[PDB]
Write a protein that binds this ligand. Structure first.
Ligand SMILES: CC(=O)OCc1ccc(C(=O)O)cc1
Lengths: 300, 237
């Protein structure tokens, strides 16, 4: 398996790895996380105990290199870095375990939750949305704005999500104003799926990444992007059958994983009432509707 | 920022602005069928697009043929209104195009914004002002041109006649909205007030009578009293 070691834990912090989180005290003996699956995509995230402002973290893929965490006392945050000397890294991680100052990832392999939430998320697409070419891992935080938000103030520190805007020339063909506004199928199928994303898997990947950035970091522009990408599908009369069925599964696991105490801040009442009850695809989201009704009846 | 007084005065600044009212676009009569059901029949309508500073009214006549074989006509009417307003703007020289379009019903915002995407510097917005433009069809010469149309048609009027030779545009707008609110509130009595003196006539190229300044003061008084009388009748005050 792979390991993410820490040099130390100088400040008290809540650390998340994928959907799991634990606390570390100030100057606790802690040297990282062990026994995590290689294989795909992960996220390690942080929220400082003495200042819950700025949640931040790093998306990474074990397979792309050896990654570790070191606290930087000048910038005041835990930073991810890459070790290019694999022998040194094996030398550490084969010992720090030997110490047992690391926490294990649990996998009760009945749980497939992480894979259901990240099925379509790929590190190389993350790196296109979060542009920092010199690192193999990608930093996101609670405050980062989207390129689209910026169009309404540092383009380097931004989330380059695909711009979705229902009242824009991209979404509306001249001469089809009412048609394209009331049935977004043109914008979904010709512009987004055939023009920009190439296939539905890449579309779902950005939707899943957006959701996870909203949930893990409380990133508002990510939440906007998640809801937009859902509403575009639901507001289209014409949507491949596979994509609809897959959307229901994707959304079901996202609603299932959402903290119950977080529904006022992560769920947009307007969008969900449209999708589940007033949209072309209402009756195609059977499992999502069932968990929403029983889990969050107040919103609806 | 909200000084009613500043928003109202600011309507008459030199930025070109158009009001758009769509309440008379889709019009129907309601009559009983032979099977005992009830049926609508559409009648000609119009878009009311007014420049409040100059009085220029762009009256686009909506002929009933545009509804033929269409569904969800109340919804379509909003989009048809937006299509025609957009076409109007595109037909105007650049220096005559509005900087703001003010829709009297919020339901017009999305249709117009979508039809106006080619003009990103034209602000589209609603208003908290209650305006009585729905009573435009109480103006006999407007109603006559709408009802006589056999095809789509655009007709230009100056809804202030020659008043701007003598009063301001905010005063003329105030006079206009008073007259239209009176016609909306008690049409037959408002028309009586206007036509009571046969020696004061409507010029062939005007909509309203050729009142002198003092007669307009008297007329305006009688309209205020008409509106207040109706209020009292309605609320038992
Ligand atoms: C006379 C009055 O009380 O209200 C003024 C007012 C309100 C809104 C606007 C506007 O531009 O939307 C203009 C004026």
């Amino acid at each position: 398996m792979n390991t993410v070691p820490f040099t130390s834990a100088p400040i008290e912090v809540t650390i998340g790895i994928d959907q799991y989180s634990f606390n570390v005290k100030e100057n606790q003996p802690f040297h990282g996380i062990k026994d995590i699956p290689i294989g795909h995509v992960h996220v390690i995230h942080f929220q400082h105990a003495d200042n819950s402002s700025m949640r931040y973290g790093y998306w990474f893929d074990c397979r792309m290199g050896n990654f570790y965490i070191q606290y930087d006392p000048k910038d005041g945050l835990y930073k991810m870095m890459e070790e290019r000397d694999g022998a040194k890294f094996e030398n550490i991680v084969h010992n720090f375990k030997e110490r047992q100052m690391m926490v294990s990832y649990p996998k009760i392999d009945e749980d497939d939750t992480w894979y259901n939430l990240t099925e379509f998320v790929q590190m190389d697409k993350i790196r296109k949305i979060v542009r920092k070419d010199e690192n193999q891992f990608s930093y996101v935080d609670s405050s980062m704005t989207t390129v689209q938000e910026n169009e309404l103030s540092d383009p380097a520190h931004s989330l380059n999500y695909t711009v979705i805007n229902f009242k824009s020339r991209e979404a509306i063909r001249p001469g089809h104003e009412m048609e394209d506004f009331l049935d977004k199928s043109y914008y979904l199928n010709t512009v987004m799926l055939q023009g920009i994303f190439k296939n539905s898997s890449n579309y779902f990947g950005e939707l899943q990444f957006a959701f996870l950035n909203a949930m893990f970091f409380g990133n508002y522009g990510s939440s906007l992007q998640w809801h937009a990408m859902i509403e575009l599908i639901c507001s289209s009369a014409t949507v491949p059958k596979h994509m609809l069925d897959k959307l229901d599964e994707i959304l079901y696991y996202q609603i299932k994983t959402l903290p119950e105490q977080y529904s006022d801040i992560l769920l947009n009442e307007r969008v969900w009432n449209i999708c589940l009850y007033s949209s072309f695809q209402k009756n195609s989201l059977h499992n999502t509707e069932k968990i929403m009704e029983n889990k969050y009846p107040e919103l609806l | 920022g909200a000084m009613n007084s500043s928003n109202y005065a600011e309507l008459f600044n030199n930025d070109i602005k158009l009001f758009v009212d769509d309440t008379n676009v889709y019009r129907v009569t309601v009559h009983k069928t032979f099977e005992g059901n009830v049926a609508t029949k559409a009648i000609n309508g119009c878009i009311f697009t007014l420049n409040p500073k100059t009085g220029h009214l762009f009256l686009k006549i909506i002929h009933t043929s545009v509804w033929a074989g269409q569904k969800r006509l109340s919804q379509l009417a909003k989009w048809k209104t937006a299509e025609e307003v957009s076409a109007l703007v595109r037909s105007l020289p650049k220096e005559e195009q509005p900087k703001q379009i003010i829709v009297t019903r919020k339901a017009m915002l999305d249709p117009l914004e979508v039809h106006m995407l080619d003009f990103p510097n034209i602000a589209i917005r609603p208003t908290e002002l209650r305006l009585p433009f729905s009573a435009a069809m109480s103006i006999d010469k407007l109603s006559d041109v709408v009802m006589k149309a056999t095809e789509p048609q655009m007709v230009l009027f100056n809804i202030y006649d020659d008043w701007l030779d003598r009063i301001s545009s905010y005063t003329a707008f105030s006079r206009l909205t008073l007259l239209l609110r009176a016609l909306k509130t008690n049409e037959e009595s408002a028309k009586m007030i206007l036509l009571s003196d046969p020696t004061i006539t409507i010029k062939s190229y005007h909509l309203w009578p050729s009142f002198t300044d003092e007669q307009w003061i008297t007329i305006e008084s009688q309209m205020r009293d008409l509106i207040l009388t109706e209020y009292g009748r309605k609320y038992n005050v």
